[PDB]
UniProtKB/TrEMBL annotation:
It holds the Pfam family GFP. InterPro entries: GFP (IPR009017), GFP-related (IPR011584), Green_fluorescent_prot (IPR000786). GO terms for biological process: bioluminescence; generation of precursor metabolites and energy. Keywords: Chromophore, Luminescence, Photoprotein. This is Green fluorescent protein. Belongs to the GFP family. The gene is gfp.
Length: 224
């Protein structure tokens, strides 16, 4: 079973290649996951210098296999069942009254490390907007994302809204549409309807003057 690969603490690498309205950028990230506690600890750097979008808008793009599924729901953990082959995760994130991201990522094992390699394409962002205008508070609220299965594709799908805080007190909706597909041909467990609960703490490393985001995350499954 793929779960046994998440017994202890396993290392994580995240490589994102992005292009937003013609502004290209890379982001590298490193840390560790502890599935039995549903915990993520990670440092992220913009290796290409300054980041043309706010850090919160990438949190969802930058490894659901590290969610804690309670014992009474362990038969519904698709993300771990697809390991070590992995899965494809694709998204369109539609920021309300602004542009959108399209992302494609594969999440697999490369040796001992769980890795997330992402291509991201942003287009149609406004000039005076929250995104390119960098008007988002540097934090991330807690969200629930309702997971459901797609029988035809042999994976899961998910539709949820993220709510970013904008500096003047209003809220920037970011509509997520998600599909997940297994890479390998081994069997995978497909779940009954349930949600993932997510909590986030965004912060800065004081010995790091590069563009960066220290991220602490707790993801637990509930709903059955």
């Amino acid at each position: 079973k793929g779960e046994e690969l998440f017994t202890g603490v396993v290392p994580i690498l995240v490589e994102l290649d992005g292009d937003v309205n013609g502004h290209k950028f890379s982001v590298r990230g490193e840390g560790e996951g502890d599935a039995t506690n549903g915990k993520l600890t990670l440092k992220f750097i913009c290796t290409t210098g300054k980041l043309p979008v706010p850090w919160p808008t990438l949190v969802t793009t930058l490894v659901l296999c590290f969610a804690r599924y309670p014992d009474h729901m362990k038969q519904h953990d698709f993300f771990k069942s697809a390991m070590p082959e992995g899965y494809v995760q694709e998204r369109t994130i539609s920021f309300k009254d602004d542009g959108y991201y399209k992302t494609r990522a594969e999440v697999k094992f490369e040796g001992d490390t769980l890795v997330n390699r992402i291509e991201l394409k942003g287009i149609d962002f406004k000039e005076d907007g929250n995104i390119l205008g960098h008007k988002l508070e540097y934090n991330q609220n807690s969200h629930n994302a309702y997971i459901t299965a797609d029988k035809q594709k042999n994976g899961i799908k998910s539709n949820f809204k993220i709510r970013h805080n904008v500096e003047d007190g209003s809220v920037q909706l970011a509509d997520h549409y998600q599909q997940n597909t297994p890479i390998g041909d081994g069997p995978v467990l497909l779940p009954d309807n349930h949600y993932l609960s997510t909590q986030n703490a965004l912060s800065k490393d004081p010995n790091e003057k590069r563009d960066h985001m220290v991220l602490l995350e707790f993801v637990t499954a509930a709903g059955i």
